[PDB]
Amino acid sequence: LKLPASFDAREQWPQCPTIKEIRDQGSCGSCWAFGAVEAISDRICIHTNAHVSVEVSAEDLLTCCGSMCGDGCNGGYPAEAWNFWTRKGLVSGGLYESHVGCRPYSIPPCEHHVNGSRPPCTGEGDTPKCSKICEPGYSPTYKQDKHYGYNSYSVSNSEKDIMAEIYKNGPVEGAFSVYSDFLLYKSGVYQHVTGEMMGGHAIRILGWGVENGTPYWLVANSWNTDWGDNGFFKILRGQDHCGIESEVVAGIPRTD
Numbered sequence: 022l023k024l025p026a027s028f029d030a031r032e033q034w035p036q037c038p039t040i041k042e043i044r045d046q047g048s049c050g051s052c053w054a055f056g057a058v059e060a061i062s063d064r065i066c067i068h069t070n071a072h073v074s075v076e077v078s079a080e081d082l083l084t085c086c087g088s089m090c091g092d093g094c095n096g097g098y099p100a101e102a103w104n105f106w107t108r109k110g111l112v113s114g115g116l117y118e119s120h121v122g123c124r125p126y127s128i129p130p131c132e133h134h135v136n137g138s139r140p141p142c143t144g145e146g147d148t149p150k151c152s153k154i155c156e157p158g159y160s161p162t163y164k165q166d167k168h169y170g171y172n173s174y175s176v177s178n179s180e181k182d183i184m185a186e187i188y189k190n191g192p193v194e195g196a197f198s199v200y201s202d203f204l205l206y207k208s209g210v211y212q213h214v215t216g217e218m219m220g221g222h223a224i225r226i227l228g229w230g231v232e233n234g235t236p237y238w239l240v241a242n243s244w245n246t247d248w249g250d251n252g253f254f255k256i257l258r259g260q261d262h263c264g265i266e267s268e269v270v271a272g273i274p275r276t277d
């Protein structure tokens with residue numbers, strides 16, 4: 022209760038479907054946008070006591086943020102994603118071909134270093150256009166459909182601070198240095214052992230726990246459910262491992 026040994030947002034906010042949700046960024050380096058919108062989704066539902074529960078649109082953020090956020094499918098930055106939500110807001114939008122919400126994701130699901138029936142993920146494709154319109158059959162206007170953030174912030178490189186933030190306000194977006202052995206993750210607690218550095222990856226942190234004395238963070242990847250542990254993974258917590266505790270960002274939904 023002053024930080025229990027383990028915490029899982031799905032259990033704290035059982036009426037919030039998005040927290041339990043794994044998405045797929047497709048052949049696009051949109052991890053920066055998915056960890057952001059995934060957490061925004063979660064916080065919207067947490068902030069409203071599930072009175073409002075929507076899929077925030079990775080599509081809106083990825084196509085419309087623009088240079089502020091980086092280079093679309095060519096990679097981007099978490100801090101600027103949340104800042105963009107506080108100023109321009111984000112509309113709802115679901116999975117590929119879901120017809121859910123205002124602007125569903127337009128990049129098809131693919132296999133991310135795993136065997137499946139979807140085509141393998143090819144590189145970072147092109148970034149779609151920013152079209153401020155909702156799908157036909159979605160009643161409210163894109164403008165009326167925007168959900169703004171009251172604020173955004175970078176949480177310090179502090180384990181306690183990160184736990185307290187998730188505990189009180191919900192899931193966060195974080196980022197870490199990906200080494201080759203992370204691609205191969207299947208289950209258990211991920212700890213870097215072999216491999217070279219492949220740049221960084223953005224994700225959603227939604228909990229923490231302890232596996233046989235090993236503290237870990239509960240994370241959602243954006244590589245579909247057939248990757249890793251049903252799309253989630255665990256990673257060593259408390260050691261700023263692969264920088265897991267250095268790039269944490271979040272913010273509070275704007276009520277109105």
Ligand SMILES: O=[N+]([O-])c1ccc(O)c2ncccc12
Nearest residue numbers: 047048049050051133142144
């Ligand atoms: O599956 N992947 O390997 C992968 C990882 C991270 C990414 O940002 C990707 N983007 C596009 C395609 C594959 C990606």
